[PDB]
Amino acid sequence: DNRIKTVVILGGGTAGWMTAAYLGKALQNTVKIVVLEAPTIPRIGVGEATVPNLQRAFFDYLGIPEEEWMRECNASYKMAVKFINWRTPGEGSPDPRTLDDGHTDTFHHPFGLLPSADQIPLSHYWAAKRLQGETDENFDEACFADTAIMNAKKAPRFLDMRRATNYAWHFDASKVAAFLRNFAVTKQAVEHVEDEMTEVLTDERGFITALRTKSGRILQGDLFVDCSGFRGLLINKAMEEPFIDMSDHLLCNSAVATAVPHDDEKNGVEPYTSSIAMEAGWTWKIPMLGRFGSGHVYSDHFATQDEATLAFSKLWGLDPDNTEFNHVRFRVGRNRRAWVRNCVSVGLASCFVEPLESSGIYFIYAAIHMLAKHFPDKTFDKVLVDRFNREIEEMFDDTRDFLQAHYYFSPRVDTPFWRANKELKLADSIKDKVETYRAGLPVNLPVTDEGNFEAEFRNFWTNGSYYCIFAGLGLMPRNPLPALAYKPQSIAEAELLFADVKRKGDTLVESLPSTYDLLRQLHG
Amino acid sequence: DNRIKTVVILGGGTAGWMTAAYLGKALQNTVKIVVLEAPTIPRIGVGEATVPNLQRAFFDYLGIPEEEWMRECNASYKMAVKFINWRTPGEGSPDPRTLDDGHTDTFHHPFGLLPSADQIPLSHYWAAKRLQGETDENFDEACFADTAIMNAKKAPRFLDMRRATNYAWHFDASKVAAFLRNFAVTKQAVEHVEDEMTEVLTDERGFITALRTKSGRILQGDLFVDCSGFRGLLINKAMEEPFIDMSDHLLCNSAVATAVPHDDEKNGVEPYTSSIAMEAGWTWKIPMLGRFGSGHVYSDHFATQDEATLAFSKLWGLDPDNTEFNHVRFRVGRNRRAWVRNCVSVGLASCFVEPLESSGIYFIYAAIHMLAKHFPDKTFDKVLVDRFNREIEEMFDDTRDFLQAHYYFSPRVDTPFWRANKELKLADSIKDKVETYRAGLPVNLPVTEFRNFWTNGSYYCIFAGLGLMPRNPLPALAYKPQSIAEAELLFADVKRKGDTLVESLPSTYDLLRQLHG
Ligand SMILES: Cc1cc2nc3c(=O)[nH]c(=O)nc-3n(C[C@H](O)[C@H](O)[C@H](O)COP(=O)(O)OP(=O)(O)OC[C@H]3O[C@@H](n4cnc5c(N)ncnc54)[C@H](O)[C@@H]3O)c2cc1C
Ligand SMILES: Cc1cc2nc3c(=O)[nH]c(=O)nc-3n(C[C@H](O)[C@H](O)[C@H](O)COP(=O)(O)OP(=O)(O)OC[C@H]3O[C@@H](n4cnc5c(N)ncnc54)[C@H](O)[C@@H]3O)c2cc1C
Ligand SMILES: [K+]
C-alpha cells in the first residue's frame, strides 16, 4: 500500500470546503480528509459571481440540487457581465453615458453559444452588416436574445422552473462556505479542526509530514492542500515557491467592498453582474434578494484607499462614515508552480486576477478537478505533478490575457489609470488572437454544443466572448470575413437566425417572470 | 468587386476533383471553376482507404448520400487498421506469427469510441488490470466490440441499414475521381479542360495570371490550386516554395502496388485494412467486392526496387513477370508554406506521409475545408494566408508524429530497417505524449478536431498493441473502488454486445452484395 492515507487541507474559505467536499466524493472514503481553519482568521468574504459550469462540474458531482444550495446562500441569477462607461470619460456613475455615435455606453458578455450558418458563427454575419452600414444593432443585441431579456430584468427560468436561457449564479460567499462545511462534515466524514497552524514539519527531501496547531496538536498527512489564501503559508512560506507578480499585465491590486440594501419591489432585480467603470478602475454590482454586493476594484498606484472609498461611496450615494467597508489588497499573478512536492495550492494561495469575469471560484473547481485526475501515490510521480502544473498555468494565462484585452482596447484616456493600461505590453497569444479577429477570422471557435466539463476547460473563452469584448469596446475587424462575399445563400440563412433571436427575445420578454418574482418564489 | 472571379485547378486526380466539387458548393456559383488535367499524365492511382469523418466533412457538404457514391466506386467498409507481424522477426507473411506469450502477433486500431466510468476511459481500467496480472485480454478485445465483429468478418450495419458501430471506407481511387468529375461538370458548372500545361504565366509581383496548354489555350485566373501531385508544378516549380523533406522522421519513401482478384464467396470480405509487416517496411491490404488493393511500402535506402517487388510477390504468391505493378517514389514532408501568393497546394503537391493510417484523402478535404474558410479576395490578406498555412502544418505534424510512434516502439531489431527506426529523432510533441502515457495519464482525451485528430483510444491501440505499457496504472484508480466496479460492468457490456452483434449482423460480403445491386 503506497497510497495517500491522509489529506490535510489548510484553510476553511470557499477553497478549503470546495476541496474537502470534492475530494470526499472523488476518493470514495479510501482517504482521511482533515480541514484545519482558524475561525479567528477570517475568509476573504468576497467571491460572489460565477460562470455557468458551476452546477454541472461541482454541485452535480456531489449530488446537491441547484435549489438546495441557492436557498442556503441567498443566491440569484446571472445571464452576463454588463460593461458600463468603459468607452466614455468621467467620474463613476451607475448610469451609462452616450458615445459620439449616439449609442449608450453599455455592452453585455452573455453565456451560451452563437448559432452558425454554413459553419460561420452569427458574429461574422453581424460584423459584415455593421461594417457595410446594413445594421446599427450592437453585437450583443443582434446575436443573443439574452440581451433583450436582461434589458427587461426577466429571469432565465419560468415560475414552474423550465429553463429559457443559459445562466450562472450570484451568492453570499460565506454562506456557500458554511453550507459546504456542513455537507463535508455530516455527509463525507471530513474532520474539522478549528485552530491556527503555527508550524509546518518537513522530512529530509522538504516534503511536508504534518502541521502543528496553536493548541499543540500535530496533524500528520501524506498530501497537503494550501487553501490559506494570499498568505500561501505552505506553497510560498514553508515550501519557498516564488509567486510570479503580473502587475505588468493588469494594474488593479486593491478593492473596497460593502453590501447595499436595495428596494427590489421598486427597481426590480438585474439578472446580471454590472462592471461600472471608474477613474482608477471599476466597481462590481452583484444583485441578490434584498441587497447587492458592490466593490470598487482599483490600482493603489493611481488612487489612495481614501480616494477610492469616496468615489465608491459617491457612486451609490453612501455616507462614508456610517457605512461598513471590507478593504483588500491582492496579489495578481500565479505561483511559478501550483504543486511543489506534496503541497498543492488551490484558491488565492495559487493564483488570482481581478474579478472582472468571475474567474476565482472557477480556478478552484478547475484545480480540484485536475488534482482528482492527477491524484498521486506516495512516489509523487514528477510527470503527474508537471501535467497538473501545466494545466493550471495555461488556464490562468489564458484568462489573464482575456482580462488584459478588456483594458488595452478601452479607448478611455481621461485619467492616468486609463492611459497607463495602454503602456503595458500584450502577451504574444493575445496579440495573435487580435490579428486573427482583425482579419475577420474566428478566435477559438467553440467545439461541442451546450453539452461534460473537460469539453469546456481547454479554451474556456470562445469566439463569442472575444466578439463581446472587442466589439463591445469598439474594436472591429478591418473588413468582413472575405468568404462571405461568395456566399449569398449563407447571408440569407443568417437573416433567419437574426429573426429567430428577435422572436425569442420578444416572446420571452412577454412570457417570463421578473427576476424579483422568480427569486421571491425560490426563497419561500 | 475585389473578389476572385476565376479559380483554375491544375490536376484531375482525387485532389483536383474533390477541390472542384467542394469549391463548387462553397462558392455558390459566384466564381468560375476550371480543372486542367492531361489524360496522358496518369493519376497516382492508389489512395483507397479513409477515416470516418469523410462522409460528415465531404459528401454531406455536397449533399451526396453515403449509398450513392459507394455504389459508383465499388466501396467497402473499414472498421480498423489491423497490424500483423509488427512485433515478431522474419520474412513477410499474411499469416500472423506467434508472440513470446503464445498469442497471435495481431492488434487492431478500430474507430469505435471508448466508453468511460467516473470520467476515465475504459483504456485505463484495462491497463490497471493488465499491469496487476488481473487480466490476460489484449486492449483491443477487452475494450471494443468492433474486435469481435472484425474477427467474424461481420458488417458495421444490419441489412435494414441500422448502424452497429463507427466505420470508414475502402474504394477504387480512379472511380471516386471519375464520379466526382461527373458531379462537378453536370451539377456545379465546372469546366473540364483535357490538355497538358506547358507554361505558368506570372505578373511583376510573382502572382500567377494564367496557365498555357500544349494546344495554345490560355486559362486566366485570380487563384490557382496546385493538384499536380509530387511534381508541384505551381507551388514548388513556378512559385519556388521549398519542400521540407522529413525522412529524418519516417524512412519509407517508395511503394510497389497491384490489385489482386479474390474469392469473396470462399474467404468472405474483411471489414478492415491490414498492415502486414515486411523486412524493409510493410504491405497494405484494402478489400473491396471481387478484389483487394495491395502495396508494399518500403525505404529504398534498405531495399532495392527488385528486392521489394520479389518480397511483395512472394507475400501473395504472385508471378513477378505476368503481374502488373505500379511503382511510386514519394516525398515525405510538407511545403514550407502550402499557400504562397495566389497558389494553394492541395494533395500530394502539398504534403504526404506513408499511407499507414489512411491520412491522404483526409489531408485533401481538411485543406479544401480550410481554403473555403480562409477564401481570399484579390488583396490576398497576409493573415488569411498565414492562418491557412498554420492549420496545414499542425494537421500534418500531428499525423506525422502519430505515424512515427508506430515505428519507434516496434520491438523488431531483425533487419537494418527495423533497427534504423530506433535511430530517428522523435518530435517533441510525441516525446511529451509518450511521457504522458507512461505516467498512466490519457493522451488527447476526446470531446463528444483536424489539429488533434488522434485521441487517447488510438494512442492506446498503437502503444499497447506494440507492447509499450504505462509504468503503473493511473494512480487515482487505487482510490476509486466503486469506479473499478462500474468499469467491470462496461467490460461485460463489450463482451455481450460483441456476442449479440456477431450473431445478428450480416457478413461484410452479404451487406456489400445487397449494396451493389
Ligand atoms: C476583491 C475580490 C473579489 C472577488 N470576486 C470574486 C467573484 O466575484 N467571483 C469569483 O468566482 N471569485 C471571486 N474572487 C475570488 C474568490 O473570492 C476566491 O477564489 C474564494 O473566495 C476563495 O478564497 P480562499 O478560500 O482561497 O481564501 P480565504 O477566503 O482567504 O481563506 C483563507 C483561509 O485560511 C485560513 N487560515 C489562514 N491562515 C491560517 C493559519 N495560520 N491557520 C489556520 N487557518 C489559517 C483562514 O482562517 C481561512 O479559512 C474574488 C476575490 C477578491 C480578492
Ligand atoms: C502509395 C500511396 C498510397 C496511398 N494510400 C492512400 C490511402 O490508402 N488512403 C488515402 O486516403 N490516401 C492515400 N494516398 C494519398 C492519396 O492517393 C492522394 O491524396 C490522392 O488520391 C491523389 O493525389 P493527387 O490527386 O494530389 O495527385 P495525382 O493523383 O498524382 O494527380 C496529379 C494530376 O496532375 C495532372 N498533371 C500533372 N502535371 C500536369 C500538366 N503539366 N498538365 C496537366 N495536368 C497535369 C495529372 O494529369 C493528374 O491529373 C496514398 C498515396 C500513395 C503515394
Ligand atoms: K514542424
Numbering used by the authors:
A (entry chain A): 2 to 452, 457 to 529
B (entry chain B): 2 to 449, 461 to 529
Paper text:
Flavin‐dependent halogenases (FDHs) mediate the regioselective halogenation of a variety of natural products including antibiotics and anticancer compounds. Flavin‐dependent halogenases require reduced flavin adenine dinucleotide (FADH2), O2, and halide salts to halogenate their substrates. We observed a similar phenomenon in Thal (also known as ThdH), a tryptophan 6‐halogenase from Streptomyces albogriseolus involved in the biosynthesis of thienodolin. We describe the crystal structures of the tryptophan 6‐halogenase Thal in complex with FAD or with both tryptophan and FAD.
Because our attempts to cocrystallize Thal with FAD failed, we soaked crystals of apo‐Thal with FAD and NaCl or with a combination of l‐Trp, FAD, and NaCl resulting in the FAD‐Thal and Trp‐FAD‐Thal structures, respectively. The FAD‐Thal structure contains FAD with an occupancy of 0.9 in both chains. In all structures both active sites are empty, FAD binds to both monomers with high occupancy and the FAD loop is closed. Upon switching from the open to closed state, Pro40 undergoes a peptide flip and Glu49, the other flanking residue, flips its side chain by almost 180° as in PyrH. There are structural differences between FAD‐Thal and Trp‐Thal outside the FAD loop and the substrate‐binding loop. Gly13 undergoes a peptide flip so that in FAD‐Thal, the NH of Gly14 rather than the O of Gly13 points toward the FAD phosphates. Val52 and Pro53 move into the tryptophan‐binding site by 0.6 Å–1.1 Å. Thus, subtle structural changes in the tryptophan‐binding site might be directly coupled to the binding of FAD. The side chains of Ser360 and Tyr366 adopt other rotamers. In FAD‐Thal, Tyr366 forms a hydrogen bond to the side chain of Asn54, which also interacts with the carboxylate of Glu461.
